[PDB]
Design an enzyme around this catalytic site. Structure first.
Site, PDB file in Angstrom:
ATOM      1  N   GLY A  40       0.792  -1.208   0.000  1.00 59.79           N
ATOM      2  CA  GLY A  40       0.000   0.000   0.000  1.00 59.79           C
ATOM      3  C   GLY A  40       0.836   1.275   0.000  1.00 59.79           C
ATOM      4  O   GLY A  40       0.382   2.305   0.501  1.00 59.79           O
ATOM      5  N   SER A  41       2.052   1.221  -0.544  1.00 61.24           N
ATOM      6  CA  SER A  41       2.892   2.414  -0.603  1.00 61.24           C
ATOM      7  C   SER A  41       2.727   3.151  -1.941  1.00 61.24           C
ATOM      8  O   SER A  41       3.402   4.150  -2.207  1.00 61.24           O
ATOM      9  CB  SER A  41       4.371   2.060  -0.374  1.00 61.24           C
ATOM     10  OG  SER A  41       4.796   1.047  -1.263  1.00 61.24           O
ATOM     11  N   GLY A  42       1.843   2.640  -2.789  1.00 62.97           N
ATOM     12  CA  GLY A  42       1.584   3.272  -4.067  1.00 62.97           C
ATOM     13  C   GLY A  42       2.492   2.836  -5.207  1.00 62.97           C
ATOM     14  O   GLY A  42       2.628   3.548  -6.202  1.00 62.97           O
ATOM     15  N   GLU A  57       9.691  -4.109  -9.893  1.00 60.65           N
ATOM     16  CA  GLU A  57       8.873  -3.795  -8.718  1.00 60.65           C
ATOM     17  C   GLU A  57       9.146  -4.900  -7.692  1.00 60.65           C
ATOM     18  O   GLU A  57       8.799  -6.058  -7.913  1.00 60.65           O
ATOM     19  CB  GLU A  57       7.393  -3.764  -9.106  1.00 60.65           C
ATOM     20  CG  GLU A  57       6.450  -3.502  -7.950  1.00 60.65           C
ATOM     21  CD  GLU A  57       4.990  -3.637  -8.357  1.00 60.65           C
ATOM     22  OE1 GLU A  57       4.708  -4.291  -9.382  1.00 60.65           O
ATOM     23  OE2 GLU A  57       4.120  -3.102  -7.640  1.00 60.65           O
ATOM     24  N   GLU A 113      -4.830  -9.221   0.597  1.00 61.74           N
ATOM     25  CA  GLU A 113      -4.079  -8.476   1.606  1.00 61.74           C
ATOM     26  C   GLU A 113      -4.898  -7.424   2.341  1.00 61.74           C
ATOM     27  O   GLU A 113      -4.418  -6.816   3.297  1.00 61.74           O
ATOM     28  CB  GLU A 113      -2.904  -7.765   0.938  1.00 61.74           C
ATOM     29  CG  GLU A 113      -3.318  -6.511   0.135  1.00 61.74           C
ATOM     30  CD  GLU A 113      -2.414  -6.234  -1.068  1.00 61.74           C
ATOM     31  OE1 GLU A 113      -2.040  -5.062  -1.290  1.00 61.74           O
ATOM     32  OE2 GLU A 113      -2.088  -7.196  -1.803  1.00 61.74           O
TER      33      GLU A 113
HETATM   34  C1  LIG Z   1       7.202  -9.822  -2.644  1.00 63.52           C
HETATM   35  C2  LIG Z   1       6.162 -10.347  -1.654  1.00 63.52           C
HETATM   36  C3  LIG Z   1       4.844  -9.837  -1.678  1.00 63.52           C
HETATM   37  N1  LIG Z   1       3.962 -10.330  -0.780  1.00 63.52           N
HETATM   38  C4  LIG Z   1       2.560  -9.832  -0.723  1.00 63.52           C
HETATM   39  C5  LIG Z   1       2.333  -8.362  -0.554  1.00 63.52           C
HETATM   40  C6  LIG Z   1       0.961  -8.240  -1.220  1.00 63.52           C
HETATM   41  O1  LIG Z   1      -0.294  -8.708  -0.522  1.00 63.52           O
HETATM   42  C7  LIG Z   1       1.385  -8.949  -2.562  1.00 63.52           C
HETATM   43  C8  LIG Z   1       2.160  -8.218  -3.727  1.00 63.52           C
HETATM   44  O2  LIG Z   1       2.648  -6.958  -3.341  1.00 63.52           O
HETATM   45  O3  LIG Z   1       1.967 -10.083  -1.979  1.00 63.52           O
HETATM   46  C9  LIG Z   1       4.347 -11.289   0.109  1.00 63.52           C
HETATM   47  O4  LIG Z   1       3.479 -11.718   0.940  1.00 63.52           O
HETATM   48  N2  LIG Z   1       5.586 -11.781   0.142  1.00 63.52           N
HETATM   49  C10 LIG Z   1       6.500 -11.339  -0.712  1.00 63.52           C
HETATM   50  O5  LIG Z   1       7.706 -11.838  -0.660  1.00 63.52           O
END
Ligand SMILES: Cc1cn([C@H]2C[C@H](O)[C@@H](CO)O2)c(=O)[nH]c1=O
Ligand SMILES: Cc1cn([C@H]2C[C@H](O)[C@@H](CO)O2)c(=O)[nH]c1=O
Lengths: 192, 197
Positions: free
Chosen positions: B19-21, B93, B161
């Site tokens: 959620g950092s954009g 990213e 998430e």
């Molecule tokens: C890169 C990474 C993202 N994520 C999560 C964050 C978010 O819900 C989504 C992608 O940003 O997955 C992880 O749980 N573990 C990871 O190693």
């Protein structure tokens, strides 16, 4: 440019079911260290993963540890398969192929590995065989019998793998057959 | 020696808390794909692994899915880091570092990953850093307070998430801070810090 290119000599893969006499067999080379690169199964690394015994955990609760445990076996198989050596002959006990085609596959069939977990392992295998060179010239298959193998296990002062059902050895045996028998160079030996 | 050595151009890694954009920020780079290799986070692969949605499973059952999920994250991230490209610039990213230093570390601390699971993931990260080449020349850190990050996730459609406790974003935040600000980790490049405001 696959990691570990021109740095791998003729490689021999010793294959077989659990209790097929692979340890006793490879011991004949135990006195050729001075000339050949002998790599036994990384069983010790599997028993000591920075303190954790993944091998003991997987057998005591497959559905929870088969995944991490198998993922580690793969890494140790990869480290051996790509390890640097000066010798002109490499002999490895088991390989990344048997861990994949036999042990991981088996665990999928019997339910130990759920769909997502299995897929994850397969994706790792696919990537590996596309970005890494696995030297596998000759394959020495120690063909045995589920029964005979089951006995040799019960005999020894086994630990982790001592409590394995005969059915487990039967399913494993069939996988080795389908791979090394029913379709490189494979030298089958009557390990009885 | 190291895999993919000498095949990677200058590489920029975009990092930030959930959620950092980051997805919005990276969009602005789309009109440059002509001269830039823009690799967005492989979320699509994590939602669809031969039919399975690991990301969803991980969020519904951390104790059981964090392990296979983080493993696959490592892989897809490793695929992006070593993918071939003729462009002179590459923007990714997140990375294999954020997965390791932030996400996996936090899942070990809160119990999601048990010691044996954490160590396996760690072993792969150690073997990878010793072999596979990982290009990193700059990191653009989109620093945001947990409060703001939480609010941003709140105002968007419901995802997997969407349920993370503020405490969770708070933990990831300190982990990104310790890594990209206090430099407690052995990172491999300069860090440019931007604000969400
Ligand atoms: C890169 C990474 C993202 N994520 C999560 C964050 C978010 O819900 C989504 C992608 O940003 O997955 C992880 O749980 N573990 C990871 O190693
Ligand atoms: C190679 C391999 C062995 N094993 C088991 C067989 C034995 O109990 C032991 C090593 O022979 O570990 C696996 O569980 N998976 C594997 O991939």
């Amino acid at each position: 440019t696959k990691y570990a290119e021109g740095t791998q000599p003729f490689t021999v893969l010793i294959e077989g079911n659990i209790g097929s006499g692979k340890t006793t067999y490879l011991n004949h080379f135990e006195k050729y260290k001075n000339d050949i690169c002998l790599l036994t199964e990384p069983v010790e690394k599997w028993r000591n993963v920075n303190g954790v015994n993944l091998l003991e955990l997987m057998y005591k609760d497959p559905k929870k540890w088969a995944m991490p445990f198998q993922s580690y076996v793969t890494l140790t198989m990869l480290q051996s398969h790509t390890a640097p050596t000066n010798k002109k002959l490499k002999i490895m006990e088991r390989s990344i192929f048997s861990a994949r085609y036999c042990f991981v596959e088996n665990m999928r069939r019997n339910g130990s590995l759920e769909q997502g977990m299995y897929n994850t392992l397969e994706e790792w295998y696919k990537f590996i065989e596309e970005s890494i060179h696995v030297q596998a010239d000759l394959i020495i298959y120690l063909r045995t019998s589920p029964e005979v193998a089951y006995e040799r296990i019960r005999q020894r002062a086994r630990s982790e793998e001592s409590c394995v059902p005969l059915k487990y050895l039967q399913e494993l045996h069939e996988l080795h057959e389908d791979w090394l028998i029913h379709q490189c160079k494979v030298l089958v030996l009557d390990a009885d």
